[PDB]
Amino acid sequence: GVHVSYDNSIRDADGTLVQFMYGGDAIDITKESHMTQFEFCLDNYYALLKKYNPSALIEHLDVESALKYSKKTLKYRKKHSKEPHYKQSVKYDPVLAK
Amino acid sequence: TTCQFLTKAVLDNEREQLDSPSARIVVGKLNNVGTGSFDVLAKVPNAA
Amino acid sequence: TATTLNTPVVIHATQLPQHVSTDEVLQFLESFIDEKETNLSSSISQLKRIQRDFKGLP
Amino acid sequence: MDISKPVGSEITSVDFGILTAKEIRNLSAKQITNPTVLDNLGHPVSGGLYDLALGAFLRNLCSTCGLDEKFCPGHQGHIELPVPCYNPLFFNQLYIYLRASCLFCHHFRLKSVEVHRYACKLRLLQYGLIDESYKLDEITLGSSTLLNELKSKRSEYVDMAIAKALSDGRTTERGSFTATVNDERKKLVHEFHKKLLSRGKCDNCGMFSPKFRKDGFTKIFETALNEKQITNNRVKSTYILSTEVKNILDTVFRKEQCVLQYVFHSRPNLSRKLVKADSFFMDVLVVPPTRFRLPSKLGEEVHENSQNQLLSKVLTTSLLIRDLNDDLSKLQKDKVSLEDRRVIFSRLMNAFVTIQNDVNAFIDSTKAQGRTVPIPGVKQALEKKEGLFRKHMMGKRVNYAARSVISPDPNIETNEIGVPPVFAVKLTYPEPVTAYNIAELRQAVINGPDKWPGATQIQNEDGSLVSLIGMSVEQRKALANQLLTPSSNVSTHTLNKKVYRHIKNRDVVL
Amino acid sequence: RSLINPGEAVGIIASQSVGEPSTQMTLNTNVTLGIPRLRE
Amino acid sequence: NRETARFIKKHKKQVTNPIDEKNGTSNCIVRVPIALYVSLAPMYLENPLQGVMKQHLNPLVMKYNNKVGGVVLGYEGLKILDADPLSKEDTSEKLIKITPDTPFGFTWCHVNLYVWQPQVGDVLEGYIFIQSASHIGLLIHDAFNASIKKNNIPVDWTFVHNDVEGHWVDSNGEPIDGKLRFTVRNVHTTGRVVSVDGTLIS
Amino acid sequence: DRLLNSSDYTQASVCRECGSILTTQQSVPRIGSISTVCCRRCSMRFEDAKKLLKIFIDDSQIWEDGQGNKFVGGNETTTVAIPFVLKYLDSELSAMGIRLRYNVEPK
Amino acid sequence: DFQQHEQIRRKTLKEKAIPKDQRATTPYMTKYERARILGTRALQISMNAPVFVDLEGETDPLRIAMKELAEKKIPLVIRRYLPDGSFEDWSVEELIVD
Amino acid sequence: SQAESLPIVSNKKIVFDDEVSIENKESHKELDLPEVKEDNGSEIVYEENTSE
Numbered sequence A: 001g002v003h004v005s006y007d008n009s010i011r012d013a014d015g016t017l018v019q020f021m022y023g024g025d026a027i028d029i030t031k032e033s034h035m036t037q038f039e040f041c042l043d044n045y046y047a048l049l050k051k052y053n054p055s056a057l058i059e060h061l062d063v064e065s066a067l068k069y070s071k072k073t074l075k076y077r078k079k080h081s082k083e084p085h086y087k088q089s090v091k092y093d094p095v096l097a098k
Numbered sequence B: 001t002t003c004q005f006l007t008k009a010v011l012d013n014e015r016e017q018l019d020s021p022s023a024r025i026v027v028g029k030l031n032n033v034g035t036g037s038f039d040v041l042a043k044v045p046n047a048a
Numbered sequence C: 001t002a003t004t005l006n007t008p009v010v011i012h013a014t015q016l017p018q019h020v021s022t023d024e025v026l027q028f029l030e031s032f033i034d035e036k037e038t039n040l041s042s043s044i045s046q047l048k049r050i051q052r053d054f055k056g057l058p
Numbered sequence D: 001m002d003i004s005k006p007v008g009s010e011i012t013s014v015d016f017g018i019l020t021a022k023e024i025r026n027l028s029a030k031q032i033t034n035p036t037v038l039d040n041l042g043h044p045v046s047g048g049l050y051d052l053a054l055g056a057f058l059r060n061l062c063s064t065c066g067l068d069e070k071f072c073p074g075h076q077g078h079i080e081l082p083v084p085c086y087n088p089l090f091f092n093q094l095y096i097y098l099r100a101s102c103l104f105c106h107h108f109r110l111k112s113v114e115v116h117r118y119a120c121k122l123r124l125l126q127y128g129l130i131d132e133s134y135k136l137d138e139i140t141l142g143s144s145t146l147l148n149e150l151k152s153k154r155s156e157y158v159d160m161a162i163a164k165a166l167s168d169g170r171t172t173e174r175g176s177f178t179a180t181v182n183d184e185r186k187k188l189v190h191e192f193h194k195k196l197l198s199r200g201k202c203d204n205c206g207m208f209s210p211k212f213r214k215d216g217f218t219k220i221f222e223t224a225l226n227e228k229q230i231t232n233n234r235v236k237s238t239y240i241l242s243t244e245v246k247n248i249l250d251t252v253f254r255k256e257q258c259v260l261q262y263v264f265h266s267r268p269n270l271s272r273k274l275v276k277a278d279s280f281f282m283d284v285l286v287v288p289p290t291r292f293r294l295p296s297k298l299g300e301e302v303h304e305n306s307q308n309q310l311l312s313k314v315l316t317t318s319l320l321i322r323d324l325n326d327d328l329s330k331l332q333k334d335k336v337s338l339e340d341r342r343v344i345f346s347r348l349m350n351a352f353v354t355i356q357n358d359v360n361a362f363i364d365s366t367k368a369q370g371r372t373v374p375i376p377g378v379k380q381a382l383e384k385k386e387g388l389f390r391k392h393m394m395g396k397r398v399n400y401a402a403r404s405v406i407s408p409d410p411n412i413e414t415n416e417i418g419v420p421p422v423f424a425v426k427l428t429y430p431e432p433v434t435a436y437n438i439a440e441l442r443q444a445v446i447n448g449p450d451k452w453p454g455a456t457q458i459q460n461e462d463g464s465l466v467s468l469i470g471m472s473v474e475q476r477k478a479l480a481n482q483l484l485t486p487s488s489n490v491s492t493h494t495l496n497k498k499v500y501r502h503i504k505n506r507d508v509v510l
Numbered sequence E: 001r002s003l004i005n006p007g008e009a010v011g012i013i014a015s016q017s018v019g020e021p022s023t024q025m026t027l028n029t030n031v032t033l034g035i036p037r038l039r040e
Numbered sequence F: 001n002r003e004t005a006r007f008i009k010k011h012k013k014q015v016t017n018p019i020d021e022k023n024g025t026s027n028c029i030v031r032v033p034i035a036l037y038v039s040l041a042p043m044y045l046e047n048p049l050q051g052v053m054k055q056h057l058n059p060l061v062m063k064y065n066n067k068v069g070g071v072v073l074g075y076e077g078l079k080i081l082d083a084d085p086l087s088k089e090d091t092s093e094k095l096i097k098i099t100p101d102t103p104f105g106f107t108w109c110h111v112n113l114y115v116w117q118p119q120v121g122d123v124l125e126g127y128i129f130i131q132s133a134s135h136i137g138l139l140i141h142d143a144f145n146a147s148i149k150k151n152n153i154p155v156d157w158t159f160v161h162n163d164v165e166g167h168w169v170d171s172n173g174e175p176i177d178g179k180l181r182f183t184v185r186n187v188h189t190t191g192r193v194v195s196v197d198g199t200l201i202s
Numbered sequence G: 001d002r003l004l005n006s007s008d009y010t011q012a013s014v015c016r017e018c019g020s021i022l023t024t025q026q027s028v029p030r031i032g033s034i035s036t037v038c039c040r041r042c043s044m045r046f047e048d049a050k051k052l053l054k055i056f057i058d059d060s061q062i063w064e065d066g067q068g069n070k071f072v073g074g075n076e077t078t079t080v081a082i083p084f085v086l087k088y089l090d091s092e093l094s095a096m097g098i099r100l101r102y103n104v105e106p107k
Numbered sequence H: 001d002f003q004q005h006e007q008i009r010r011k012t013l014k015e016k017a018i019p020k021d022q023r024a025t026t027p028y029m030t031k032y033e034r035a036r037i038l039g040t041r042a043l044q045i046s047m048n049a050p051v052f053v054d055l056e057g058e059t060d061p062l063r064i065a066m067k068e069l070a071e072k073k074i075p076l077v078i079r080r081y082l083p084d085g086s087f088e089d090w091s092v093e094e095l096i097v098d
Numbered sequence I: 001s002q003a004e005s006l007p008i009v010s011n012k013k014i015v016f017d018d019e020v021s022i023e024n025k026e027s028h029k030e031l032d033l034p035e036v037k038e039d040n041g042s043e044i045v046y047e048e049n050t051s052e
């Protein structure tokens, strides 16, 4: 019964929770292959983008809010970067948790 | 231990709320999996 | 016979039954006989005979 | 199943409970008392194990619902045990509460104020108030009068708290039950179990109760009292019948009801139903409907259902009982010596045993003596090979399927599967009949069951099947054009016929 | 667009990604290894 | 007992029909609001209101029904209760749960029910239509059967028959015919249609 | 599909009251009546009820069985689909004195 | 007293649902949502349901449903359940297809 | 004492089952088996051991 709900959490059938995200990032094990093949990516760009087609999801998705936070966490990451894992600045949680 | 676990339910008067897949297969209710996480509705007009 | 196709599995009454005078009865008979104009036709034929009884006739 | 017979009625939840002698004697269509099953020509003996009041049998009609061997869903009957007998499945739990029971003040031989505490927890633990359960023990402010004040304060909290947690969304009335909450429960419960058995001298009156012994064949003995215990008992070993046990326990289950209420319920009891001791006792067995207890056929010669044979032993036995009993009433009580009482008790002990044994012999062949191979009982039935469940509920053999050796082919496509003729002509999918397909389904029906593409049968609007089997052109030809006929029944007018066409390349297969 | 779809019984799926490869560990090449190590 | 072996009470039909109007006849007609859980064909996907009538409502008219306690006469105002409990009661469009297996669906709705429901003991008049040496047959409001048993007729009435090609005669000597005034003693409903068992004595 | 719809999927009745499928029978109807579905566990014998003492009896309530006893009440039934074996199971369970009471909906 | 139980059922059910403006789930049609969309509707179409598209020569209830979803005419809706009773209602037409 | 010559069940049982064990096999030998192609085309088989 373990599955991914509609809230991105990983619960059993009885509601009991096991994880708060799949791989801790919630990525499909198959849509992965070329998720980081940046090379073979900027190659065919125009083909890739044709497939995904931004112009559609425009009015649907938030294009900002998230990004704004992806720069705050990066800043405060390189700030408390060096220090050990128990001195971390819990001041900024990942972008995925919010 | 099919028999014993049974005793665990009777002696607790447990309510098996037919949730876990295993529990449904017996009753035949559609499982929580994928095509059984949501539902279906008919957008029918002429109701006012 | 009585299938789930043409018969509700369960039905209940919200309020409590309420008496109605003969007048209301007729005005109802009317509105319902007019609306319906297939076994519905052999039945309303039985109604029209009772609406004709609430005025005095065979 | 069909796409035109739905139902909006469905069970939401399932519960498990004991069968009281009441519901049983009320729902039972017939009582069973006779061993033999058939007369001298092959007919259901009255009160026999195949009486028709349990489900149609042979060529006869059910004497309860009026259907036959095809349609009679069977109606469980019953068997009356002319003596109380421990349920072999719960004998263990029975034993526990027996030894912990004081046989004088009818409480548990554990402290009353404690048992109280424990109850409170369980109650909180039906609502997931794990903290409150432990935040309840933190109470001993400040003889005898002081004790009634604690048992009060502890309570008015635990109870109050449940209202606090009910006032917000933390719990409903049915309860909150998760993997977690569940834990602290099963833990705490067992803790209460050990503290019960632990106490030897009763703390609620100061009396010692002679301890009990056990057998595997569910036979409770009673050893006498130690030297210091006879002494302490006045300052303040033999078989004991299955009924003597019933009584003692009962009174205890009537006094200490309070706690047992939250011992036997994982959720708050919305039915407020009493918890009696008779739960662990079987005075009446439920004879399953005949339609289950069907004998086997060795192709030709028939074999008696096993389970039946077992019940028959119960019967034959159950008889000798009322026989010895009606004989107990012919011995005038002036000739009954105090010595003769002893050889009497023997006959009695003898009964309760052999009957109880046979009872188990059907429930669990384990807790039953040997004949030599033994006869499968309920238990050895639920776990048949992998388990009745995995073998026939998670592992069902099904219609519309076919295994065949597999050979290669690069000419078809990857997403393809080669379909051999000798198959497709036998595999058929129920397609709805309308306008879009009418062109097709027509043609097919014509070609009949032996020419691909085509079909083998037609479902009208009333569900009846139409085998185009031994049919030829004409008969088909006609039945064909009748695909778009109206409804004779105003009930099923919404339905259209369904043709059972051959499996074509447009379809899909697993 | 490369996310995992709400629903997938990743649980069951994982039980597979374990039980299937554990069939190549039929043979033998310090510690505990293979079929047993999984038992523990 | 506790509260269960005394809840069989909720069963005495709480609709006492009166002998008002002075006519001496009991007023029986009644208005009762109810609920309704039904199935809709894929065909009437665009004709919801309709399908309910052709599928369920219509095959009730002039038939006894075990629930209302009486005979169905007709309905008023078949309103739909949307499945999306947030929309305006407007939007002519209204969702409804769809059966797991089949394309059909179900919902709850409200509708007023006008019903005849004579309970044992009431008094009514009926046009006689037949007479045999055992029973008096009549029709209340020209529709519903009714039967007066032999030993329910006044133990002084008399019976006779004709010849040229039967009939009763009351206390005095006039052959009773047309408007008879009985009182319901029983009600047989399990048959093909309704059935009224009356009398006419103390 | 593979584990019901083409295996042992069966329709059956259920007493809405006590939630049972083991006691749901047909009504032995008088010649010229339709067969009802009632619950033998929730019904009373007509004679036993008459002992409840000032209202009058009812018709559609009564129902006779095959043997010839008259009964009343317990006419709260419904229809549902389940795998056959489930029945068999319950039967065996009840042979130990274990009842299943599956709260039935829509209540 | 059933008017009382009906008042509670109809109150609770509403509370459960989530207003269309507070919808915080993926606006993408899901793998499972798609497979059932065409299927169920096909069952409808196969049983004389109103066809909002042109058949152009179809003889399969499925392929139809396909052509239907295509032009986005499928007048159906899905009840997405959060593993806690709460839920948002989304229509096929308002969801992105892929 | 009407208990000094009162039998004990353990032994009366062993005689009772004997006969009964017969009037069940023998009586089952003078019986036919009526096939009920349960409304489907199937076949209501009459066994009690599908050992798969």
Ligand SMILES: [Zn+2]
Pocket: D054, D055, D056, D062, D063, D064, D065, D066, D067, D072, D073, D074, D075
């Ligand atoms: Zn039957």
Ligand SMILES: [Zn+2]
Pocket: D102, D103, D104, D105, D106, D107, D109, D202, D203, D204, D205, D206, D207
């Ligand atoms: Zn004591």
Ligand SMILES: [Zn+2]
Pocket: G015, G016, G017, G018, G019, G020, G023, G039, G040, G041, G042, G043, G074
């Ligand atoms: Zn019942």
